[PDB]
Amino acid sequence: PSAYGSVKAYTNFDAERDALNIETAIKTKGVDEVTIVNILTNRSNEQRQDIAFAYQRRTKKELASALKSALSGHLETVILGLLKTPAQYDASELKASMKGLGTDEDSLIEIICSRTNQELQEINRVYKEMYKTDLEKDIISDTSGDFRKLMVALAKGRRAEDGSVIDYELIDQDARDLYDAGVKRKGTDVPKWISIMTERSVPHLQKVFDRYKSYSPYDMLESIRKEVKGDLENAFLNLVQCIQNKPLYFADRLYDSMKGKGTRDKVLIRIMVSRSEVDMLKIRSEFKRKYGKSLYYYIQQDTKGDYQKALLYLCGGDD
C-alpha cells in the first residue's frame, strides 16, 4: 500500500451496509448525491470493489449502471471513474483517447508516459480482456511515424528495473549519446533518443539527464523543444518530466487544467482519480510549493457543487 495517497481504507468498514446506503440515496427523491459522494470518496479502491459486489447481491443490478442513471455531468464522470480498478480505469481512458477519427494525443501521452512497468503490465492485460484486442495494436493503429514508435516502446512496460548499482560509465555514455544525437548535430537521431529514454531505469536516466547538462548548453527539456516538434515533442517533454519528478509533472498538468478559462475537466478528473491512492500527497506538496496556493484552493475556484465536493475529498485537504 502506497503511503503517499490521499484516500485510504476506511477504518471501520462493511460493504453490505454501504451498498444499502448507496441504494437508499439513489432511490431518494432527486437523488442524494451528497451521500453517494461522502461514501465512495472516503473508501479505498478495493473497498469500492466489495461495495459493488455487495450492491449487486442485494439489487441484482450492477452498481456502475445504477449510479450512471442517478447521476449526470462531471460528477457522473468522477464517480464512474472511482469505481473501476486502476487498470480498468487506465484501460478505458486509453481506449477513449483513441476512439473515433483522430487521437487525443494529450491523454494517450499522459498515461503511457507516467505508468510504471508493473502498472502497464496490468493495463495491457485488462485492455485485452476488456476490448478483445491489444493495446499495442490499438496504439499502432491510431498513431504513426516516430510518435508511434515512442508510444509503442513505453506501452511495453519493459523498462530495465533499477539496479542497486550506479553505473557511472553508462551514465556518462548515455549522456554523450543524447547530446550527439541532437543538439550537437544538424537534425536528430530520434531512434537513439527513444532507445535510451525507454530502456534505462528511471533512477539511471535521472542521473543521465544531470550529466547531460555537462555536455550540452541546454538541459534535456530545452534540448527537446529545440530538436523536435508535434506529438513527438509533446511525448518526450512529458516523459522527461515523469522521469525527473512525477509528482511535479502532475501538479503542472493540474495547474494547466484550471489556470485559464473554464476547466479541462477530462484532465483534472483523471488525475484526481488515478493519483488519489498513489502520490496525491507529494503532488499537493509540489503544487503548493510552486504556485503559492493549495491545489485544494484551485479546485474550489474552478469547480462547484457535488462535483467540487468530490474532487476536494479526493484531494484530501490542505484546505
Shortest distance (Å) from residue 233 CB to Ca ion: 5
Question: Where does this chain touch a copy of itself (CB under 8 A) — which range of 187-195, 228-236, 276-284, 293-301?
Answer: 187-195
- Identity of the residue, 3 or 165, whose beta carbon is nearer to a copy of itself in the bound complex: 165
Residue 229 binds which of a copy of itself, Ca ion, none (CB < 5-8 A, kind-dependent): Ca ion
For 214, residues 6+ apart whose C-beta sits below 8 A from its C-beta are 175
Per CB under 8 A, 186 contacts a copy of itself: yes
DSSP string, 79-132: HHHHHS-HHHHHHHHHHHHHSSSS--HHHHHHHHHH--HHHHHHHHHHHHHHHS
Closest CA to 41 of 13, 16, 71, 78: 78
CA-to-CA distance for 99 and 167, rounded, in angstroms?
Answer: 42
Residue 102 binds which of a copy of itself, Ca ion, none (CB < 5-8 A, kind-dependent): Ca ion
Shortest distance (Å) from residue 173 CB to a copy of itself: 6
Exposure class string for 255-281: b at 16+ Cβ within 10 A, else e: eebbeeeebbbbbbbbbbbbbbbbbbb
Residue 142 binds which of Ca ion, a copy of itself, none (CB < 5-8 A, kind-dependent): Ca ion
- Identity of the residue, 182 or 247, whose beta carbon is nearer to a copy of itself in the bound complex: 182
Question: Where does this chain touch a copy of itself (CB under 8 A) — which range of 87-95, 189-197, 215-223, 283-291?
Answer: 189-197
Per CB under 8 A, 213 contacts a copy of itself: no
Give residues in contact with Ca ion (CB under 5 A). 30-31, 72, 98, 102-103, 142, 182, 225, 229, 233, 258, 263, 302
Choice from 34, 141, 160, 168 touching a copy of itself (CB under 8 A):
160
Per CB under 8 A, 169 contacts a copy of itself: yes
H/E element, 310: helix 305-315
The distance of Cα 62 from the centroid of its chain, to the nearest Å, equals 26
- Identity of the residue, 136 or 233, whose beta carbon is nearer to Ca ion in the bound complex: 233
Closest CA to 308 of 80, 75, 76, 82: 75
Closest CA to 81 of 316, 307, 317: 307
CA-to-CA distance for 19 and 116, rounded, in angstroms?
Answer: 33
Shortest distance (Å) from residue 191 CB to a copy of itself: 6
Chain residues in the site for a copy of itself (CB under 8 A): 160, 169, 173, 177, 185-186, 191-192, 195, 199
